[PDB]
Amino acid sequence: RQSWLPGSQIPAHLDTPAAQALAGNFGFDPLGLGKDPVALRWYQQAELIHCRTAMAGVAGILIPGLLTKAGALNVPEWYDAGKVAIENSFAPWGSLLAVQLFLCGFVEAKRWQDIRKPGSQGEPGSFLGFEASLKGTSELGYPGGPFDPLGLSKEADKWADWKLKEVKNGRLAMLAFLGFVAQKYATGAGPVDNLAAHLKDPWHVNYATNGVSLPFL
Amino acid sequence: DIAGLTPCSESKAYAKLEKKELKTLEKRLKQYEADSAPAVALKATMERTKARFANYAKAGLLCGNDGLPHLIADPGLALKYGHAGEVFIPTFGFLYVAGYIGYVGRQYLIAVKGEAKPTDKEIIIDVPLATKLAWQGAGWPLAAVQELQRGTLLEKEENITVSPR
Amino acid sequence: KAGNWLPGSDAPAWLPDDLPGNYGFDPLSLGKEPASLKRFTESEVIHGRWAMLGVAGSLAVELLGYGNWYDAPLWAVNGGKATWFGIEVPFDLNALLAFEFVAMAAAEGQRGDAGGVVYPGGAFDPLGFAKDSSKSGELKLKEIKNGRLAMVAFLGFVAQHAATGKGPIAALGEHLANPWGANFATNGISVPFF
Amino acid sequence: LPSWMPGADLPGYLNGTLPGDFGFDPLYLGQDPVKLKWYAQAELMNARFAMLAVAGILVPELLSNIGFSWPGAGVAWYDAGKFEYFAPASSLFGVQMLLFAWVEIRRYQDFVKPGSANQDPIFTNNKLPDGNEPGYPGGIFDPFGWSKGDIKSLKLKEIKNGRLAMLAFAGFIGQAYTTGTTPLKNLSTHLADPWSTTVWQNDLA
Ligand code: CLA
Ligand code: CLA
Ligand code: CLA
Ligand SMILES: CC1=C[C@H](O)CC(C)(C)[C@H]1/C=C/C(C)=C/C=C/C(C)=C/C=C/C=C(C)/C=C/C=C(C)/C=C/C1=C(C)C[C@H](O)CC1(C)C
Ligand SMILES: CC1=C[C@H](O)CC(C)(C)[C@H]1/C=C/C(C)=C/C=C/C(C)=C/C=C/C=C(C)/C=C/C=C(C)/C=C/C1=C(C)C[C@H](O)CC1(C)C
Numbered sequence: 001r002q003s004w005l006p007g008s009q010i011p012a013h014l015d016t017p018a019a020q021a022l023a024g025n026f027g028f029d030p031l032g033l034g035k036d037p038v039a040l041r042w043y044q045q046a047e048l049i050h051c052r053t054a055m056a057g058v059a060g061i062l063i064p065g066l067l068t069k070a071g072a073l074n075v076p077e078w079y080d081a082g083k084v085a086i087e088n089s090f091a092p093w094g095s096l097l098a099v100q101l102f103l104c105g106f107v108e109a110k111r112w113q114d115i116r117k118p119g120s121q122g123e124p125g126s127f128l129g130f131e132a133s134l135k136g137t138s139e140l141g142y143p144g145g146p147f148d149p150l151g152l153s154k155e156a157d158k159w160a161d162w163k164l165k166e167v168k169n170g171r172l173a174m175l176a177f178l179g180f181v182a183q184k185y186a187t188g189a190g191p192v193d194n195l196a197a198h199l200k201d202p203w204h205v206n207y208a209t210n211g212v213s214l215p216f217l
Numbered sequence: 218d219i220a221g222l223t224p225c226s227e228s229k230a231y232a233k234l235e236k237k238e239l240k241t242l243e244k245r246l247k248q249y250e251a252d253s254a255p256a257v258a259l260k261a262t263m264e265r266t267k268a269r270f271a272n273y274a275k276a277g278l279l280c281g282n283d284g285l286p287h288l289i290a291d292p293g294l295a296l297k298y299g300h301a302g303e304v305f306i307p308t309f310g311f312l313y314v315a316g317y318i319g320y321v322g323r324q325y326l327i328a329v330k331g332e333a334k335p336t337d338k339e340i341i342i343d344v345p346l347a348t349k350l351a352w353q354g355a356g357w358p359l360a361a362v363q364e365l366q367r368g369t370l371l372e373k374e375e376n377i378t379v380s381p382r
Numbered sequence: 383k384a385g386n387w388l389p390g391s392d393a394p395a396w397l398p399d400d401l402p403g404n405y406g407f408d409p410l411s412l413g414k415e416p417a418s419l420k421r422f423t424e425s426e427v428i429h430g431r432w433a434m435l436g437v438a439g440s441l442a443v444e445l446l447g448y449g450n451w452y453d454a455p456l457w458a459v460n461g462g463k464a465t466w467f468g469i470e471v472p473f474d475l476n477a478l479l480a481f482e483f484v485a486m487a488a489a490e491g492q493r494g495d496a497g498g499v500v501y502p503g504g505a506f507d508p509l510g511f512a513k514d515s516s517k518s519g520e521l522k523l524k525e526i527k528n529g530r531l532a533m534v535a536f537l538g539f540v541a542q543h544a545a546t547g548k549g550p551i552a553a554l555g556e557h558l559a560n561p562w563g564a565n566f567a568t569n570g571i572s573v574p575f576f
Numbered sequence: 577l578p579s580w581m582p583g584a585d586l587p588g589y590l591n592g593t594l595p596g597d598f599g600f601d602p603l604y605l606g607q608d609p610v611k612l613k614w615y616a617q618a619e620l621m622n623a624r625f626a627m628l629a630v631a632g633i634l635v636p637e638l639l640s641n642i643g644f645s646w647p648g649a650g651v652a653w654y655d656a657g658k659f660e661y662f663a664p665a666s667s668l669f670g671v672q673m674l675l676f677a678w679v680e681i682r683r684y685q686d687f688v689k690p691g692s693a694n695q696d697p698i699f700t701n702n703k704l705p706d707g708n709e710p711g712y713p714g715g716i717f718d719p720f721g722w723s724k725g726d727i728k729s730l731k732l733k734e735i736k737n738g739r740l741a742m743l744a745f746a747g748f749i750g751q752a753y754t755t756g757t758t759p760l761k762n763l764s765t766h767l768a769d770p771w772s773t774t775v776w777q778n779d780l781a
Binding site: 388389390391562563565566567568573576 | 662663664665666667668669670685689692693695697
């Protein structure tokens with residue numbers, strides 16, 4: 001098997017049939033958090049949700065960020081998108097935050113009750129009729145039905161590969177967003193401009209020169 | 218402002234105290250030479266002093282009638298008026314490190330109770346095991362809430378209670 | 383089996399054959415369960431009838447020249463008075479709201495008490511069609527197909543007026559004027575990167 | 577038995593059934609047979625669009641230097657987006673995506689279930705023959721009576737010209753980004769002086 005550190009002793013809780021059947025297992029647990037299988041279950045759920053929302057957010061940063069260097073899509077910088085949006089908008093930000101709290105709390109409550117009980121949300125008479133297709137698909141965190149419309153999740157031969165691509169791209173996306181934050185506080189411009197200013201002069205413009213990222217040198 | 222005071226930037230007493238400290242310091246400085254290490258240390262003190270006053274003025278501190286900074290210990294009030302860095306952030310920092318120390322210690326104790334002589338490994342520290350557990354708990358709060366939610370944090374009533382009632 | 387929405391692909395197992403508009407169209411597997419499927423049949427037919435009525439209404443309004451469907455309710459926010467075919471309507475917004483609430487509440491409660499019934503009879507059959515239950519199945523098929531078409535057309539109305547702000551027949555007229563010069567690529571809000 | 581490196585060990589999963597099987601995969605991209613199928617179909621499609629593209633960049637420019645007078649007088653291949661047509665490019669994009677949605681989803685439906693998209697939905701007499709071969713349709717898509725010969729030769733030829741055309745279109749992109757000129761003019765100034773017009777020569781400016 002692959003390991004993060006070849007030659008390192010892989011911990012015994014990440015070496016089970018239950019833990020090796022997880023997407024993107026690389027035996028990485030230096031701080032031994034996942035000693036409890038229930039806790040490992042919950043943490044896997046946390047990783048999946050963070051992956052999906054991280055991909056969505058970072059794509060939202062990049063793709064308008066890239067395409068604005070072309071002609072179309074005049075988009076302001078991601079750290080200024082809220083202001084301009086709310087000046088474009090019709091309501092104050094408080095009411096928008098309240099509405100999103102409601103509409104997201106409902107859904108997250110659903111998903112949470114499905115985490116505590118696996119076959120929960122599908123029981124007769126609960127919803128007006130989507131109770132038909134709100135069960136799980138035998139692997140928690142990966143529902144079916146109205147999710148996965150295109151039927152890509154039906155074939156069994158591509159299954160682990162779709163999983164593994166998801167988790168790898170997601171981990172990379174989380175790293176990307178943390179990078180967005182740090183580059184915002186460090187240099188003071190958009191990430192696309194950081195990429196351009198680094199490709200323009202690599203040996204002079206990096207975090208060894210920005211004067212904040214390591215002040216002792 | 219916040220309970221009848223003013224920020225230190227326009228506080229008259231602040232600048233008077235600053236001038237007084239510089240005055241005594243230059244008074245000590247006067248009697249030496251211009252190359253002497255006494256004068257070197259004295260000018261270092263001047264630099265650190267003026268830098269300290271500028272740093273306290275920059276952070277938006279609040280001074281009473283004595284010209285001294287006052288800390289605000291109230292979540293709503295400090296978070297509303299921009300003072301989260303004087304009690305709030307410090308208390309979460311301290312709780313993190315203190316729970317960290319306690320959790321590491323507790324894990325050591327359970328790690329050594331399972332041996333043949335628990336007292337020797339208490340008087341003579343198992344250094345490899347101690348360093349190992351010293352790393353393994355940097356995220357303690359997650360392990361703490363898991364131990365709480367599984368009911369292993371608390372012993373049941375097999376504790377020795379005083380006799381009699 | 384009125385058809386198959388995707389030649390070659392197998393029909394879903396949960397759709398029963400004797401059913402109007404049974405094309406086997408279900409990628410999401412939404413009607414795999416019985417009771418939910420029955421409820422969805424009810425909802426589809428009812429939405430179809432209401433869509434037919436609304437689309438026919440907006441067409442009649444614009445075709446007989448009384449503004450669009452968007453400025454029919456214009457008389458209530460900006461002060462004025464309702465109309466029908468060239469005659470004034472003597473009511474207030476709250477008056478029609480009250481009579482609408484009472485009438486619709488009464489009618490829909492009455493309907494919503496007889497279990498789930500989609501085809502009544504007798505006094506909702508006053509002309510004498512669908513008596514033999516033979517060609518009634520075909521009439522069910524025609525009903526549901528025209529209903530699906532009406533729903534799609536009404537969603538078209540909402541999107542079209544949300545895009546260009548003109549009425550249906552006005553949009554069709556100008557599109558017949560210059561076909562390539564004005565449709566949903568000259569929209570400027572449909573496809574963004576143009 | 578041909579190789580891309582005569583003597584070197586070929587990967588075991590390649591067996592000559594694919595057209596143009598030269599045993600070239602130093603990154604081992606096609607170990608799973610499913611990925612091999614998808615990659616093969618992708619190669620065919622990329623190849624055909626490359627061949628049509630390179631034809632559509634050579635032929636207008638080749639017939640530009642000869643001096644005809646259709647309004648495509650040699651403007652460019654990359655300046656095809658600033659010309660007055662008889663329709664703005666938006667509706668072009670719309671009709672394009674509608675028609676190609678129809679065609680490409682139809683083709684994908686053939687690929688997932690081979691032997692299922694053969695007959696004409698409207699005029700249900702017209703039907704493709706049962707020589708399905710996902711990626712090689714047949715019937716009216718081979719209208720002039722070919723495929724009579726040993727088609728492995730013609731498949732091999734199609735894939736060779738496709739690979740050459742893909743590299744050619746990559747060439748058009750690279751040359752037009754670097755020198756910023758038309759490609760037959762690049763061949764013109766290279767046939768003018770082959771020894772002082774090279775890549776190493778131009779990249780030192
Ligand atoms: C140790 C107890 C204690 C005490 C005496 C106070 C005292 C105060 N808090 Mg407070 N607070 C505390 C703990 C405490 N805090 C803690 C632990 C939190 C974190 C949950 C907060 C979070 C908080 C917020 C978010 C706000 C206050 C505010 C206030 C002020 C008026 C409200 C009040 O007295 O409610 C009585 C308080 C208690 C009985 C103690 C329980 C703590 C509750 C949760 C705080 C109640 C907030 C209150 C409902 C807000 C009223 C709004 C006001 C405009 C009327 C007052 C100076 C408000 C403020 O800024 O005033 C200007 C305000 O907005 N507090
Ligand atoms: C009013 C909504 C509605 C409802 C509830 C139904 C219900 C049904 N249809 Mg149906 N249908 C509708 C509208 C509707 N139809 C329309 C408008 C068309 C024309 C496009 C069709 C065409 C159609 C075919 C061709 C077939 C069905 C079939 C069915 C049955 C099984 C499928 C199922 O589980 O449906 C459940 C449906 C829903 C839960 C729909 C809810 C709406 C979803 C959740 C959101 C849609 C959002 C929309 C895409 C947004 C567009 C915005 C725009 C800007 C892009 C079921 C009785 C099958 C059958 O046997 O017929 C009886 C079948 O083969 N339908
Ligand atoms: C006020 C009295 C009243 C009452 C008591 C009822 C009662 C009923 N109606 Mg009903 N109806 C009424 C008025 C009323 N209606 C009016 C005025 C209309 C418009 C003419 C309709 C249109 C209507 C349709 C079309 C349907 C019903 C249905 C039903 C039944 C479902 C009950 C239920 O749980 O729904 C609870 C419903 C809700 C809490 C609201 C659902 C809101 C939906 C999901 C949002 C739709 C999108 C929204 C409109 C935004 C669109 C924007 C637009 C620009 C496109 C029930 C018997 C359904 C039925 O018979 O199925 C069995 C059905 O299909 N009714
Ligand atoms: C593994 C492990 C294990 C062992 O045991 C121990 C240790 C080592 C400690 C660990 C590690 C860990 C880590 C590292 C983690 C990380 C994380 C992250 C980064 C996340 C993020 C994450 C991230 C995320 C989600 C993100 C998201 C985002 C978003 C939404 C965005 C949004 C937006 C947009 C769109 C745009 C607009 O305009 C604005 C805004 C609003 C801004
Ligand atoms: C089927 C399926 C299946 C699979 O599985 C999945 C999926 C695909 C998702 C699905 C789909 C779905 C869909 C598409 C749906 C649609 C719907 C609609 C559109 C409705 C409408 C609906 C609509 C409707 C009713 C409408 C109605 C209307 C009306 C009444 C009107 C009214 C009016 C009038 C008197 C006139 C005036 O001037 C005004 C007004 C007031 C305006």
